[PDB]
């Protein structure tokens, strides 16, 4: 299903420079791990028309490519050939432990960005771990050391609604109906609101933002490679964050 939408050759063309010496994650991210992870989430790249499936895969890889980018405008083959360069948040400044009864933080552990989606916060490591059958509150480092677990956490985030946010998967496959609150916030279906779902607090609703732009650059390149249109509403420059 994922392999029916994106081949090993297409995966490598997209993630062209991930195994450069300039990349910390060199050798970590493999096509096999990506495919293995996708087996845990049967709807991913397998929901809707062939175009919707292509957008699902392209948007996933584009958003995650930005999360982990080592790109620069004048980098070899352009900024959008340098996704999946990192696997751990650079100079992570925080524990990212927001106390709650639901997701207790493990002593001495930190929930900074790890893996393709740069999964952060105890409140994401908790449910991600539960979904994949691995205790990620106690062993968050596993997101940075096991490639299959790494991709699975990213797909978990992609596929999972967290009210009032829909899943990014639902958005990109055209299965999301904005609420009245969404309409008032200027959140229309498209790649843009996915950026908002992932990191809208820091990136959205304040006009031009180079991180938002970077995500779109990867998306357009990956859509061109798979042979699919981008859809509408690619940015979140004028979207209020979800909270
Ligand atoms: C003046 C000049 O041209 N200098 C060159 C440098 O720009 C260049 O180094 C590269 O610089 C870009 C920014 O310009 C940098 O891009 C950033 O990459 C990080 C790491 O992936 C991203 O951080 C993620 O952000 C998201 C939020 O958006 C977090 O959720 C996530 O946790 C973060 N991930 C990690 C792993 O920490 C930044 O978002 C991204 N910035 C932007 C604006 O997109 C590249 O990583 C730099 N590349 C390298 C290899 O360090 C340098 C090399 O080309 O050359 C200088 O001359
Ligand atoms: C400093 C820095 O660079 N940090 C980056 C991280 O912030 C980023 O991880 C993403 O972080 C945002 C928060 O900024 C997070 O989004 C939050 O998600 C929670 C849980 O879904 C929401 O909390 C719920 O809100 C509703 C109301 O809206 C409540 O009813 C409900 O009870 C809340 N649940 C809990 C458990 O508190 C937040 O509202 C929401 N905030 C925003 C602004 O959207 C994302 O999930 C994080 N994304 C990921 C992939 O982890 C990370 C990745 O970009 O990079 C760090 O560098």
Curated annotation (Swiss-Prot):
Keyword Signal assigned: yes
Recorded effect of pH on activity: Optimum pH is about 5.0. Stable between pH 4-8.
Enzyme Commission code(s) on record: 3.2.1.14
Keyword vocabulary terms for this entry: Antimicrobial, Carbohydrate metabolism, Chitin degradation, Chitin-binding, Disulfide bond, Fungicide, Glycosidase, Hydrolase, Plant defense, Polysaccharide degradation, Signal
Tissues and organs where the protein is expressed, per its UniProt entry: Localized to the starchy endoderm of the seed May localize to other parts of the seed including the aleurone cells (at protein level).
Reaction(s) the record says it catalyses: Random endo-hydrolysis of N-acetyl-beta-D-glucosaminide (1->4)-beta-linkages in chitin and chitodextrins
Role summary: Defense against chitin-containing fungal pathogens. Binds the hyphal tips of fungi and degrades nascent chitin.
Protein name per Swiss-Prot or TrEMBL: Basic endochitinase C
Organism: Secale cereale
């Amino acid at each position: 299903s994922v392999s029916s939408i994106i081949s090993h050759a297409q995966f490598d063309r997209m993630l062209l420079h991930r195994n450069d010496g300039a990349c910390q994650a060199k050798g970590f991210y493999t096509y096999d791990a990506f495919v293995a992870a996708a087996n845990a989430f049967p709807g991913f790249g397998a929901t809707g028309s062939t175009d919707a499936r292509k957008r699902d895969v392209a948007a996933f890889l584009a958003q995650t490519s930005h999360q982990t980018t080592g790109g620069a405008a004048t980098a070899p083959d352009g900024a959008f050939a340098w996704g999946y360069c990192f696997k751990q948040e650079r100079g992570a400044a925080a524990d990212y432990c927001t106390p709650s009864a639901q997701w207790p933080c493990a002593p001495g552990k930190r929930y900074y960005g790890r893996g393709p989606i740069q999964l952060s916060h105890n409140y994401n490591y908790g449910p991600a771990g539960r979904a994949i059958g691995v205790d990620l509150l106690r062993n968050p480092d596993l997101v940075a050391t096991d490639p299959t677990v790494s991709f699975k956490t990213a797909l978990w985030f992609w596929m999972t609604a967290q009210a009032p946010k829909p899943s990014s998967h639902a958005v990109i496959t055209g299965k999301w109906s904005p609420s009245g609150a969404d309409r008032a916030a200027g959140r229309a279906p498209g790649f843009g609101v996915i950026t908002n779902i992932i990191n809208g607090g820091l990136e959205c609703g304040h006009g031009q933002d180079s991180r938002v732009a970077d995500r779109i650059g990867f998306y357009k390149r990956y859509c061109d490679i798979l042979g699919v249109g981008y859809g509408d509403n690619l940015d979140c420059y004028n979207q209020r964050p979800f909270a």
